[PDB]
């Protein structure tokens, strides 16, 4: 028995955009896990087609962490929204285990087709 993710993870929102200063506000679904030394955000998700630069305020309030994305993958899900068409976005450089955990929790709890 070797499993993908016993004990799941959490998520709250963040901002995103197309280019460097295109960030307006909440446009994403950015998954994360809380490391003691700052929480690492894992997986973004978009109703928009082509985003390439998201941004997160610092734990100190001085700087801001930028996150540029790789090309998306499309999928549609079901919920009282009916057809729920989106594009998953993994922060570029995310390795295979992190994508595995994200997809695991997502497809396990969130409806998919």
């Amino acid at each position: 028995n070797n499993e993908l993710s016993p004990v799941a993870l959490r998520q709250m929102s963040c901002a995103a955009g197309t280019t460097q200063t295109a960030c307006t506000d909440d446009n994403a679904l950015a998954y994360y896990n809380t490391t003691k030394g700052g929480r690492f955000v894992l997986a973004l998700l978009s109703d928009l087609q082509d985003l390439k630069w998201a941004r997160f305020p610092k734990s100190d309030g001085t700087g801001t962490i930028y996150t540029e994305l790789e090309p998306p993958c499309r999928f549609v899900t079901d919920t009282p929204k009916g057809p729920k068409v989106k594009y998953l976005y993994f922060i570029k450089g995310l390795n295979n285990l992190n994508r595995g955990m994200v997809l695991g929790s997502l497809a396990a709890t969130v409806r998919l087709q």
């Binding site: 999928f75 295979n96 285990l97 997809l103 695991g104 497809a107 998919l112």
Partner: protein
């Protein structure tokens, strides 16, 4: 009873003979790579829930081919059936058979895996990484089953020593082609998993010594073309065995064929960078860390170790 054996044999017509008493299981001590919410490690546990039947060749001789049929609840049955139906066209996947039988006033589902090997890759890795000359029966049996040596070779005691009797390296290097074929089949399986949309972790105890894969019990589904195989502990635990057995020897022959002459290189050639990238692409396609053939381009000393 005996209708059980006839149902297990199926359309294969294989002349099976029991390895246990009746329709009861068979307990063995085997090596597993385990990680869940309670325990973790690479250790020898007690495998219980399986009935095994050994296939008989003609002339009534027993061959190294087994039918392993185990017993399931009604949910894992459907889960494995769905995943297998998605993955049944790969040549690196073992043959499965799902049915229902009557043991008592009950109908119980069974899953049969056809034509497996007595040992797995985890058994070989554990045997060679936890060597103890006071008890090494698994290693002896693996060595004599695949024609690396004969049974009396173990009478020239000090036979395991590397300094005394340096001839054991020639005996160990007879497993290299088996290991190389296993690597190729793993790459094939990963490609199929990605194209079908399956996400799972690959362990050494779900591959036999022929190279075939089974046990799709912890796998999940996504959209096709977006699957993810996780292969971080497989390759890493298997790494020390690739140089002991000299698995890549066939790469020095004309068309990767051991029955052909050696490649004759130009003497004035020293670079060999594209060859290194081709080898990495052929055997380690889904290892997802950057590889630098020249360590002038590495980022720190951890990367230097990784690439060297």
């Amino acid at each position: 009873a005996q209708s059980f054996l006839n149902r297990v044999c199926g359309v294969s017509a294989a002349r099976l003979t029991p390895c246990g008493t009746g329709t009861s299981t068979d307990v063995v001590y085997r090596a597993f790579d385990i990680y869940n919410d309670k325990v973790a490690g690479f250790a020898k546990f007690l495998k219980t829930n399986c009935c095994r039947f050994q296939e008989k060749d003609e002339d009534d001789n027993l061959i190294d081919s087994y039918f392993v049929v185990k017993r399931h609840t009604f949910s894992n049955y459907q889960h494995e059936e769905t995943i297998y139906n998605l993955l049944k066209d790969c040549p690196a996947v073992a043959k499965h058979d799902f049915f229902k039988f009557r043991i008592d006033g009950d109908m119980v589902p069974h899953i049969s895996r056809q034509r497996l090997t007595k040992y797995t890759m985890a058994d070989l890795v554990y045997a060679l990484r936890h060597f103890d000359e006071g008890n090494c029966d698994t290693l002896k049996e693996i060595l004599v089953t695949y024609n690396c040596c004969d049974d009396d070779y173990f009478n020239k005691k000090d036979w395991y020593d590397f300094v005394e009797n340096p001839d054991i390296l020639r005996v160990y290097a007879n497993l290299g082609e088996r290991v190389r074929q296993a690597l190729l089949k793993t790459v094939q399986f990963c490609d199929a998993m990605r194209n079908a949309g399956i996400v799972g972790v690959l362990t050494l105890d779900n591959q036999d010594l022929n190279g075939n894969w089974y046990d799709f019990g912890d796998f999940i589904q996504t959209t096709p073309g977006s699957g993810v195989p996780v292969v971080d502990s497989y390759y890493s635990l298997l790494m020390p065995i690739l140089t002991l057995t000299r698995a890549l020897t066939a790469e020095s022959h004309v068309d990767t064929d051991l029955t052909k002459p050696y490649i004759k290189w130009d003497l004035l050639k020293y670079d060999f960078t594209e060859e290194r990238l081709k080898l990495f692409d052929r055997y380690f396609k889904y290892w997802d860390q950057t590889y630098h053939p020249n360590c002038v381009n590495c980022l720190d000393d951890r990367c230097i170790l990784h690439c060297a």
